[PDB]
Amino acid sequence: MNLEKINELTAQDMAGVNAAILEQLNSDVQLINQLGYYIVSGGGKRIRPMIAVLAARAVGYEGNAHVTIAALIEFIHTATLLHDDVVDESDMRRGKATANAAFGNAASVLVGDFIYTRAFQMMTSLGSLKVLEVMSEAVNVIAEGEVLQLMNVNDPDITEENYMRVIYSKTARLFEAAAQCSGILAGCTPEEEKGLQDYGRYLGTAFQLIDDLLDYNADGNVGDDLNEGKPTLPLLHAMHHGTPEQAQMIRTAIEQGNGRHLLEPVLEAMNACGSLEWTRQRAEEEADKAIAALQVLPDTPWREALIGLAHIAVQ
Amino acid sequence: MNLEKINELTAQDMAGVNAAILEQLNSDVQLINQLGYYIVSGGGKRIRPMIAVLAARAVGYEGNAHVTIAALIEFIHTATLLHDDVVDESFGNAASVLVGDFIYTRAFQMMTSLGSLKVLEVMSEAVNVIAEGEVLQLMNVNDPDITEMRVIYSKTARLFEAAAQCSGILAGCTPEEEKGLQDYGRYLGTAFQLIDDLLDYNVGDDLNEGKPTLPLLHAMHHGTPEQAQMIRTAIEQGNGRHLLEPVLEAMNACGSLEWTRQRAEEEADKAIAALQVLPDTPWREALIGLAHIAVQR
Numbered sequence: 274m275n276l277e278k279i280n281e282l283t284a285q286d287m288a289g290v291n292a293a294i295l296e297q298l299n300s301d302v303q304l305i306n307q308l309g310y311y312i313v314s315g316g317g318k319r320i321r322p323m324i325a326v327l328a329a330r331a332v333g334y335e336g337n338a339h340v341t342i343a344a345l346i347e348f349i350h351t352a353t354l355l356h357d358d359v360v361d362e363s364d365m366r367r368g369k370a371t372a373n374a375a376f377g378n379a380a381s382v383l384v385g386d387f388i389y390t391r392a393f394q395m396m397t398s399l400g401s402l403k404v405l406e407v408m409s410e411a412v413n414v415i416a417e418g419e420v421l422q423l424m425n426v427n428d429p430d431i432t433e434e435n436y437m438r439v440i441y442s443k444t445a446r447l448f449e450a451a452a453q454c455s456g457i458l459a460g461c462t463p464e465e466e467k468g469l470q471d472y473g474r475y476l477g478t479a480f481q482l483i484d485d486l487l488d489y490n491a492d493g494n495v496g497d498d499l500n501e502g503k504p505t506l507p508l509l510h511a512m513h514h515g516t517p518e519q520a521q522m523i524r525t526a527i528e529q530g531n532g533r534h535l536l537e538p539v540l541e542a543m544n545a546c547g548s549l550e551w552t553r554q555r556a557e558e559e560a561d562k563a564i565a566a567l568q569v570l571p572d573t574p575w576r577e578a579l580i581g582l583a584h585i586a587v588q
Numbered sequence: 589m590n591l592e593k594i595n596e597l598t599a600q601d602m603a604g605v606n607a608a609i610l611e612q613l614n615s616d617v618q619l620i621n622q623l624g625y626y627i628v629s630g631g632g633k634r635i636r637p638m639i640a641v642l643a644a645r646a647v648g649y650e651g652n653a654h655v656t657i658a659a660l661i662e663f664i665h666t667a668t669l670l671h672d673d674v675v676d677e678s679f680g681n682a683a684s685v686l687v688g689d690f691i692y693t694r695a696f697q698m699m700t701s702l703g704s705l706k707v708l709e710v711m712s713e714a715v716n717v718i719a720e721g722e723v724l725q726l727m728n729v730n731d732p733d734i735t736e737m738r739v740i741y742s743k744t745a746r747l748f749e750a751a752a753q754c755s756g757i758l759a760g761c762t763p764e765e766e767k768g769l770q771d772y773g774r775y776l777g778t779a780f781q782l783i784d785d786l787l788d789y790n791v792g793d794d795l796n797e798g799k800p801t802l803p804l805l806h807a808m809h810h811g812t813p814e815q816a817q818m819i820r821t822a823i824e825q826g827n828g829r830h831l832l833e834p835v836l837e838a839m840n841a842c843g844s845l846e847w848t849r850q851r852a853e854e855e856a857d858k859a860i861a862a863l864q865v866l867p868d869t870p871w872r873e874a875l876i877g878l879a880h881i882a883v884q885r
């Protein structure tokens with residue numbers, strides 16, 4: 274199932290989601306509504322709400338509480354962007370200016386808090402304490418993960434298995450929760466629930482790995498990870514497999530939290546070791562674990578589209 | 589029922605509150621840990637959790653989930669101060685944003701662990717209103733206005749209101765009792781913020797930023813024409829830096845501080861009056877005492 278056909282199957286749910294997002298931008302304070310509109314209409318893929326919508330349909334859900342959770346998921350994600358952009362001091366995202374470049378840091382942080390607290394209101398109104406517990410843990414764990422990276426020294430000598438552990442237990446948890454809570458809301462089976470949960474985790478993992486490799490895929494939002502010496506998978510691979518010169522270069526970049534001027538050198542180092550392809554290969558295995566976790570659910574068009582999203586994510 | 593007797597009656601409860609704060613705030617990052625220390629060993633009289641703990645007790649609660657409510661309210665407060673410390677071009681922005689995100693999100697985890705949907709409805713609405721209000725205040729430095737009570741309600745009162753109310757709710761209190769606690773928190777919160785506004789002309793940021801607070805507005809409406817003009821243009825300019833002396837002259841000569849404390853006293857009486865719906869206990873006596881203390885600076 275290609276993107277076009279996934280979009281076609283999902284179109285009416287996704288349009289209910291678009292409506293439900295725009296509905297909740299209803300403050301007296303216009304700055305909230307305009308900054309929120311600014312970011313939500315900017316071309317987002319809305320893959321997290323897409324996964325939620327699909328999962329509920331994949332386990333037979335007939336109502337439209339799933340549109341609601343998809344919308345609030347896109348709100349959580351939106352709030353995490355607005356904060357990421359302020360933290361990472363970014364001026365551009367997706368071709369154009371960021372919320373903080375356009376409106377400033379304070380409004381960015383504060384409209385993000387509004388947006389997060391609204392999603393938590395939307396979630397409460399669905400009346401599942403279980404979903405609230407799962408979702409509110411996933412967000413706190415992501416925020417904890419950000420404070421760790423900030424306040425500490427990146428360990429260049431992290432094991433690969435411990436790197437994946439960070440993704441499984443923290444960075445992908447929104448993807449995990451998007452699928453799982455949708456399942457829980459549809460009264461799904463415990464087997465089905467664990468299936469969607471593992472699919473979300475694995476797809477988000479695959480997605481995180483591809484995003485990281487794509488950050489180095491230049492010549493067409495490229496190079497930011499190496500500029501701040503961020504210890505991602507492809508960069509660490511080149512450090513372990515490159516020449517001790519390349520290694521030591523990539524090492525000082527991670528130790529400084531600064532790899533400015535280093536892009537082309539690291540590209541050549543990566544290209545020699547096959548680091549990008551090897552990351553694309555690690556990602557494929559994640560996509561297959563996601564696809565395999567779904568086999569516990571009925572064979573449906575919605576299941577095909579989830580399987581389709583996983584293949585698409587790993588190009 | 590003075591401050592020290594209120595502290596001793598609320599002591600065992602506050603020990604649980606303090607432990608829950610340190611429990612939820614031990615991290616592998618030291619900034620977070622030190623924060624917990626500064627909260628529990630903080631300088632102030634922490635009336636927010638004290639109200640949360642007393643509101644429950646005063647409606648028959650014998651459990652210990654009101655300790656979680658107390659803790660999470662103080663988390664909400666703390667995280668909102670952290671996000672206020674974020675600035676634009678002209679403990680950095682990154683750490684204020686992220687540590688405040690960690691704390692706010694943990695507060696939501698703690699709310700939801702109590703297992704009440706009613707509490708979560710109310711607590712999630714109050715925090716949304718607060719966040720909305722911070723953004724209003726932002727729009728207000730960009731376009732000042734000399735109105736009139738809606739800012740302080742969102743900035744301060746709403747969270748006192750939710751703290752009293754949800755504690756009531758969590759003890760399965762009567763709807764009458766819920767309303768009395770809820771109003772008690774709203775009126776005490778309002779009185780608290782009015783007292784705080786008046787104490788700022790005594791560290792002094794409100795005037796530096798040309799913030800239209802109650803004492804400054806009163807002086808603009810009752811002061812001589814020159815004082816009126818001076819104040820109006822500091823508010824609309826967003827800058828009263830160095831004007832303290834002539835503003836204080838204006839406030840003293842037409843009674844702006846005293847009039848503000850009096851209006852705070854009025855709100856505190858209302859808080860007390862909402863509480864007469866509850867049973868007569870030492871817990872209610874202590875709630876009543878907090879309202880008096882809040883409005884004697």
Ligand SMILES: CCCCCCCCCCCCCCOc1cccc(O)c1C(=O)O
Pocket residue numbers: 350352353354356357385386387389390412415416419686689692693
């Ligand atoms: C009042 C409560 C407000 C709480 C706000 C909740 C959000 C937690 C705060 C941490 C934000 C971290 C962003 C997660 O990473 C991303 C996510 C998505 C896209 C991205 O590019 C990124 C990225 O790492 O660059």
